[PDB]
Structures are given as structure tokens and as C-alpha cells.
Nucleic acid binder design. Structure first.
Lengths: 183, 183
RNA sequence: GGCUAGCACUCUGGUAUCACGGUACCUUUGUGCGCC
């Protein structure tokens, strides 16, 4: 298969899981150690269902930029023995544009789905659900319910996390390297 | 949770795949190098559908004993670059009886299913579906379509591959170490 | 302690493949967890 799909299969196999909260079912990406990322709307409580197993949440941080502006991502630390593969070397300093990317989703509704989305562009500012958000990535692709959390990727690059769309376009929160320096 | 469940999760993550042949959908287990196992009834052709991707089959071996009796397993060598993790050390020399096992299945009908199995006993000779067969393991089990290929496991041990049942017991072809000797 | 009990990550070397970005397995090491 294509080198990006080869990369995407490894990423979902080693670093993704299916997560259920009070607000629905999400693809979840582990970054390193016990730190993982979710869309902000997942709003995890004291515990989450991770591959249908109850996993305690030690700490959860909703990310904002220097401006206080929403980034639409939540970092949570998981109370589990297992460590995640350290994929921070696959994360960029700043936003990345690629001519072709893959969107990978792992939920009971979209199992093992790797969707080619083509051009990804820096979109910047966006009003999601009445909330101003920054650092959004755009890709022309019809988006449906249950895709939030999908991992947007290119060979050797994890670009961001799917967080919404408008029926003809998709939007990802960019996944920057310095978000994972310490917290 | 349970150490056998931990073992089965890793086994499915690292060594299993979902296979479609002309004869239906099956769980498939990779053993070492590029060799995998299917139930004989899967009857794989020159190419296979492996996680909905077309994979050429270099060579396919139907196992019989020295007398010529059916063992209900087919070994096939895959035309792919990637090697399977070597699990030959998790296979026994002779048939194994265990008090508790897991049957692990991953098909569109039984996705990510881990079924607890009680007592597993070497039952030996059996007439499966009009065919004489040997080296069978028996365990009390519901008989349902799409379960063939399931991986019968215990912690640190791959016992065999589920190949059928009679509505009240399930049967696995025992998965012996000498079937996969380097030569 | 060992497991005929393994799991996860980390590290070190290989081998193959790759659109050279990676991927897969193997090997060295260490940490955590689990026991027979």
C-alpha cells in the first residue's frame, strides 16, 4: 500500500483507541507516556471508556493559545500501566500543508477506516459552534457525525485531529510539537 | 484485565488480520516470516483480500497427517514485504488441555470479540461436515456463522484455530509447533 | 524466585522494503506491570 497508508495503519494500531464519554464515541490518539489527545467537545469526566475498558483520568487540560483562544483539543493523562509509543518526532513545529493526506477513524461506526482527503491547507481562524478557535486545518471532504477525533496524517507526519466540518469541508485542530514538551 | 485477555489483545493486534476469500470472511493468524494459517474450508485462491486489500498468495499448503487424514488447516505464504512477529514459541509440541481459554475473532460479524471458553480437551478424531478429521480440540460453545478462524488461546499459548461445531460444542484444529519448522 | 506467562514502552544493533518521509521483523538494554 501507499507509504502514507502504511504510516497510517501503524499509527492507529500503536497509538489510537476508541473512547466513549458522556458525549459520544471518539477516536483517541496517544502521544507519549500516558498522555493522549481528544477533541475538546469530548469533555471527559473522571473516567473514560477506552476500548470498552474503564480507565481513570489523572489530569485533563483544554488547550488555549497565548491569546486565550480556543484550540478545540483536550490533553488528558491516563491512569494506565501501558505507555503510548512516543510519536512527538512526527509532530511539527508549526502548521503543515500537504498535497495529499489520509484521515483515519477508529470507532464502532467507522471501523478501520482510512480516508484519502487530498489537499490540506492552513485555514487559521474559525467560529465553531459560536466559539472562536485558531490554528484550524481545512480539507475538502464531507464530514459526518462520529468522525471527531480522526487522525489527519501524511507519511511521517501527524497533522492534526478532526474536530468538525460543514458538509463539504473538514477541519482539524493542528497538532503542534510544543504542546507536548512538558504537559 | 486478565493476563489471557492482555495476551489475546496483543496477539490480535500483532498477528491477526481479517481475510475474505471466495468462500467468506475469516480471522487469519500470522505465525512467522510470511506464513499464515486459515481453516481449510477458506480455500484461498491466487490472491486474498486482507483488511480489504488485495494480497497475492505465493504458496498454499493443506495439512494432512502421515496417513493422509484431513487436519482442516491451510498454510499460506503471503507476497508482502512485512514479516509477522515470530510466535512459534507460543505453540506446543503436542495437544494441550487447559481449564480456561479465550476465542478471539475479528470479522465484520464478530468484530473485536473475545469469547471466554471453559475446559478445552483433546478430542482427536472427528467427522466434521462429512470429512474425517484428526487432532481436534473440543469445548462447549455456541455454533454461529463467521466464527471459523478464531484464535484459541491461553496466556502464552496459542492452542489452535476454531474450525466448526455441532450446535453444542466447538472444535479447533490444534496448532502444533512442528507444522512451522523453518524447513 | 521462577513461570511450561506474559504485556507495554525505551534503547542498541541488524535484515527487508520504501514515493527515502517511513514501515515491518529481528537483536541488544533498561523501566513499569503481571504472575506459577
Amino acid at each position: 500500500m501507499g507509504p502514507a497508508f502504511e504510516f497510517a495503519v501503524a499509527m492507529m494500531k500503536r497509538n489510537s483507541s476508541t473512547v466513549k464519554t458522556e458525549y459520544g464515541e471518539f477516536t483517541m490518539l496517544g502521544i507519549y507516556d500516558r498522555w493522549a489527545v481528544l477533541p475538546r467537545h469530548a469533555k471527559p469526566g473522571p473516567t473514560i471508556l477506552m476500548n470498552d475498558q474503564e480507565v481513570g483520568v489523572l489530569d485533563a487540560k483544554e488547550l488555549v493559545d497565548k491569546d486565550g483562544t480556543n484550540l478545540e483539543l483536550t490533553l488528558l493523562k491516563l491512569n494506565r500501566n501501558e505507555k503510548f509509543r512516543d510519536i512527538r518526532g512526527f509532530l511539527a513545529k508549526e502548521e503543515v500543508e500537504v498535497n495529499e493526506a489520509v484521515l483515519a477513524i477508529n470507532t464502532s461506526k467507522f471501523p478501520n477506516m482510512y480516508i484519502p482527503v487530498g489537499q490540506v491547507t492552513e485555514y487559521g481562524f474559525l467560529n465553531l459552534g459560536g466559539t472562536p478557535t485558531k490554528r484550524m486545518l481545512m480539507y475538502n471532504f464531507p464530514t459526518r457525525a462520529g468522525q471527531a477525533g480522526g487522525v489527519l496524517m501524511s507519511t511521517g507526519k501527524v497533522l492534526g485531529i478532526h474536530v468538525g466540518g460543514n458538509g463539504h469541508q473538514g477541519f482539524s485542530a493542528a497538532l503542534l510539537k510544543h504542546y507536548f514538551n512538558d504537559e
